[PDB]
Amino acid sequence: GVRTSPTGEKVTHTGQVYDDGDYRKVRFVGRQKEVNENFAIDLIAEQPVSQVGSRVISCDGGGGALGHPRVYINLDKETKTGTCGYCGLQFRQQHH
Amino acid sequence: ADTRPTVRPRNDVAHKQLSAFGEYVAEILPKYVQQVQVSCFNELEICIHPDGVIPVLTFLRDHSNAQFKSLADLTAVDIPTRQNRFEIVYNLLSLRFNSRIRVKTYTDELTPIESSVPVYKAANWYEREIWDMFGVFFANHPDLRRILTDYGFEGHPFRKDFPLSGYVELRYDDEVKRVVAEPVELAQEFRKFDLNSPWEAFPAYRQPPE
Amino acid sequence: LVSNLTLNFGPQHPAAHGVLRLVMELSGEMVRKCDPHIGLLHRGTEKLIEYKTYLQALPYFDRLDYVSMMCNEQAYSLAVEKLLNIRPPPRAQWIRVLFGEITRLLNHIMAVTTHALDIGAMTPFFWMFEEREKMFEFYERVSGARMHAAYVRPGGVHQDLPLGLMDDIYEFSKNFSLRIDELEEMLTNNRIWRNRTVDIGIVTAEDALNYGFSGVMLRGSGIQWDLRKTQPYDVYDQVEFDVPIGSRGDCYDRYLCRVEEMRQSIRIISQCLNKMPPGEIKVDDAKVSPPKRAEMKTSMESLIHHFKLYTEGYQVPPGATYTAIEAPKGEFGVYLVSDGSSRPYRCKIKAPGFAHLAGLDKMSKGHMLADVVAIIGTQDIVFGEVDR
Amino acid sequence: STSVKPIFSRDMNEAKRRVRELYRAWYREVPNTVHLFQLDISVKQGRDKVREMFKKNAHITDPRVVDLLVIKGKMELEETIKVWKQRTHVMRFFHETEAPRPKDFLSKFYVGHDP
Amino acid sequence: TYKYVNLREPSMDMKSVTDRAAQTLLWTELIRGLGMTLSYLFREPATINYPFEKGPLSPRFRGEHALRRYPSGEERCIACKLCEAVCPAQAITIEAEPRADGSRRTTRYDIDMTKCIYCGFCQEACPVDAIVEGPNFEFSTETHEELLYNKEKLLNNGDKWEAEIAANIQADYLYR
Amino acid sequence: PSSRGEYVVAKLDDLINWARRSSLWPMTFGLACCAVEMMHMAAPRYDMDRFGVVFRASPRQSDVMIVAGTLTNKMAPALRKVYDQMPEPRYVVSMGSCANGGGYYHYSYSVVRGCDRIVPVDIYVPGCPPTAEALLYGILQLQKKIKREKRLRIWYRR
Amino acid sequence: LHHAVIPHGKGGRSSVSGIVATVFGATGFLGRYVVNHLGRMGSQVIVPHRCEPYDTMHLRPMGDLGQIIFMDWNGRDKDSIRRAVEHSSVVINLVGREWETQNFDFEDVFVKIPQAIAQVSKEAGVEKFIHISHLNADIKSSSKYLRSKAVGEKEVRETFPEATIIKPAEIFGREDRFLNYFANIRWFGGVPLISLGKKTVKQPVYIVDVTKGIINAIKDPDARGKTFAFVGPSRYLLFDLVQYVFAVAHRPFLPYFEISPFEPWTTRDKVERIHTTDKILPHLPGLEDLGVEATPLELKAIEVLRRHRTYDVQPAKTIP
């Protein structure tokens, strides 16, 4: 989601934008404010939750040595979805 | 030698020889030598009163059992926590006996050390450097002056109280058509990371209480 | 003094050894005195290292002598190992030796060729530099960086050799000796080369010791001394090679010595490939050797030791030492001083070219002006370590 | 106790000698310096600057220090005499490009934070 | 064990002397010197054709730092500041705040490609293989400011080359 | 023949912009490690000379300066002096990372933080050292940068 | 002042001053000092230009990273002008020529271009403005350079009533085309042709003096709307100057070139300004008011013509 300011400048996934009065945006004149449109926060939300059997499920981001360290995610609480700290993929215990 | 690939095999024979060779120099020149110590990695240390730079260095160079022909290295270690802040160090080689000894003195800003150039021609420039970077003055040096720093460097860099970024940064100015100097300004300051762990690392080296 | 001239190399010519401002005092045709100025490249390396971790400081030693890289790192590594009181695994010691000789090949090729480039001999510069290009790949295929590999570290090396490399180093070594014989076929017997480096810059045996010379300067005038034979460090006690010794003392012998050392490097590599042992490449002491990524991403202790060794480094026992190696140019060593913290307190770098340059005045007495070209070159002076 | 090894001068009376010896060394060299480097300041200006650096050290009292201050001066002069310095190095004592740094209190309180 | 390099004694026999006398007046060894050069004329030059050809490299090659993403697309970096704390030249600047969804992530991440020394330490210290160095090296710029890569530039490069960075890491992650 | 004033300028302007880039004679400043790569770039493998870029030229008949290595405060005045002696046109190319922002030695008292302070740089080549191939890319890139010059056209429109 | 322009630092190279200056025609002899002085303290600077980007390189060292910007524009266009002045805390116009082309005559560079710039600054709401007028401006003046100049001094005082128009006398400096004009152009390959330079009074000023004046004007809040002229501290006669010049330049002297493409030398109208007397305007505030002292031509003429001097000179007599 690239939502632009009324002044006409894009807003990054960090939210920074040179507001109306600031002179610092003059640099872009004749050039462009390079931004990356693959907003990280959006893409993860697209990925679906996963159903598991036991209270504890292990996440490694897939690939073992090529992923983040191994973390064990509690899932006793059912009012919320367990989340892997590193990659952010969610898990939830099923029918309970 | 022992069967432990992750440890350094001790060579005690060479260590014993240095201790035997220890008193050999402590007895011969007791007017100067203050302290002689041997480190566990087979390196002899001789502590000499600063006056005895020539008597001691000249001895080992020529004695019939030292024969330390070549001067390996010559520097100083700034240490602002001592009255004699600086600390010269001479590293000597001996091709005949195939061994190295280290000789150290102590001085300060205003107490020059006699040039050892007569003993070794090697220290012709190493003594310029020590003066250039640390400020210690060498008496009777044939030609003492800056060797490393830039001309008119109003300071002695390698002192521990000399900021890493200096005091003036250069730049070229069109108004005067020549390089100029100004007080140093950094686009990004040098971040000063604090690394010291708050837990005692080696109990062996523990300094006793005060 | 008749007419002192500030002969300057600031407008550097194609020699790539640094920038040298030389102040001389001629008497007509013949030179009579010299006074090199060497501050032109002093960057302050010996002062910055006091703010870095021993690990962070390692890349500096790579940029001291920028034609003998991996040899420099080995010099620093041995010093830290010695103070750490740990030994690299036997496989590591062979790899480091394997590249020490390869680096020594790199250094001499630069030394002999450029030393011949300065005297107008231009063809030998290329032929051998092509081999330097091939050798760069071995640097690049193990460490990923053509020159400043930083491959050698305290505790062994970083990554093990990739497959098909030793089987490819062998290919280089086998045909290499033909390259040198081509080199000698235009320098040794050539009369023009002889006229330039015979009876030039003769150094007396006693003086060489007094001024503080080392390497091909000492052994170029008869002195029998090579730290690879008297004070071996890694495995040199377990290989066979003959330290060439000259007798005349002039430049010619030093040129012969360097060419002979390269051949004595091949005789060693031939033994490193055949004797290369198996095992791990780094000390299996996690507190000094950060674990491989496999264990870091799986085990608790394996992670912490990968979280402190890359932010705080390893503590070193308080102390100081001087360690030296037979670097290609000459004796190279560091007077590292540790006060117990993960950052060195002091590090003096004994550049072999520092003493070999101060002694230029002595060697330059009573020689034509053009002979300083063949005198500076024969010493293999690189101002990266002269100034630091 | 104050037993201290001297460098050259055993007392201020001898030490002050080299200072006057030194001052003449500069005072007679400024004319050469201006012409040698083709600077663009009259011979008068250099000596006036020279006095300043000598003057700011009038407060000194230690015999050793004056020997040290003197020792540096010879090196500075020797480089100047031999033309080892360069036109740039000569003018670094005058601070041309540096704009007037304010020094009174109300000046400081209007420009920034430095006391 | 040593050996002598220049200790030959010229035998004073007439034939031998005539050879050294023959050598001088006929330049034979110099005629030989013209021989080796002639051979190299008829050899095949080792010159490659750039840019239509490239110099062989290796998977471990170090190039333009870049920031990676998981297969899902999420940023791998978690602002652990290991890379900053180890970059010898202090060419890395980092800031982080808890993102909207309360996940540790960066806000400001800058690499100074002029203070960088291209040492490879950053990719060694990353516990999640986020910051790496791609096989690209042709990124010379006409201005100094262009060579200051911030978070946006690094992410784009990572996305730009990711088709290759993984391929190299795949073949080489075992040695590490 | 026939052509407007604008057209004839472009073609005869296109010529010189081609001559001044097909024949570059670069002065070399071998100040540090990155000096070595400059030698490799001239070595047999790449043979920078194959593009007309000769190996050695008198600093007072150069065509482009390639600052390679660190720029010490002591050595800075010499560099500027050399720069002023270069006949126009003169293009300066910064090579490496210590000749761009002080590289490894950015915080060294005796290092000029980026040679651009002493002279105006045209092309910046990153990498310490920039692989001998990358440096060659910069030189090729410089020729294009020349190729995008329109002196006479601007002159005709004065 | 705007939040991002608050002063910060100690005024060095990388210190932030807060002066977002847009300089028009900065490529000229006068501009490069103004740019350099603005760059000295690190003030953000935008530099529109018309020539090749190559010709702007020498300005680059004068500014820190991201403080110097090289846009493009055209006098005949106002769309380009707006971009370069959209967020400038001040705008400086330094355009001008010593000769006329077939594209931009004297009026275009001295009337419309100074104006067109002024209006857009008003349209964009620029808070300040500076304009370089000529000391001898008068619509009844002989020199079309001056007559064209005299028109511009009016609109700029009208379109931007608060613009600080400045009217300096002849300027000299290292790259000046006045002291270098006499030494080389007048004499080289040609004996002096002075047409009885006995009545004229010339009062040139030093380039550095002008440069320091402009910056001080920007800082001052009360300088809004005023008008200044900068004149050396000592008046002189045309003939006395030329004769004295050859003493410093050590060229032979004998008391008493057409218009072509390229940059002409010794143009028809340029002569009138050499002979034209310097106006005496005691009522207009000058350099001394800006906290700037005039530097006598004796002190600084040495450096400019030192190069003319191939490989003990009484200073020129003054005229009250």
Ligand SMILES: NC(=O)C1=CN([C@@H]2O[C@H](COP(=O)(O)OP(=O)(O)OC[C@H]3O[C@@H](n4cnc5c(N)ncnc54)[C@H](OP(=O)(O)O)[C@@H]3O)[C@@H](O)[C@H]2O)C=CC1
């Ligand atoms: N010595 C003097 O004349 C004195 C100074 N002044 C005024 O100071 C001002 C600046 O002085 P100075 O630097 O020596 O003047 P310059 O001759 O150097 O020209 C100043 C700028 O104007 C540019 N220029 C010329 N024509 C145009 C155009 N159509 N459109 C845009 N820009 C153009 C020039 O660029 P380009 O080169 O590409 O054309 C140049 O950058 C002058 O205008 C002058 O009236 C007033 C009193 C005395």
Ligand code: SF4
């Ligand atoms: S390669 Fe090394 S110097 Fe460069 S950014 Fe990475 S850690 Fe820093």
Ligand code: SF4
């Ligand atoms: S080391 Fe990796 S995960 Fe940690 S801050 Fe750096 S890029 Fe991010």
Ligand code: SF4
């Ligand atoms: S830029 Fe690269 S080659 Fe040059 S001095 Fe720095 S690290 Fe060495």
Ligand SMILES: [Zn+2]
């Ligand atoms: Zn996960």
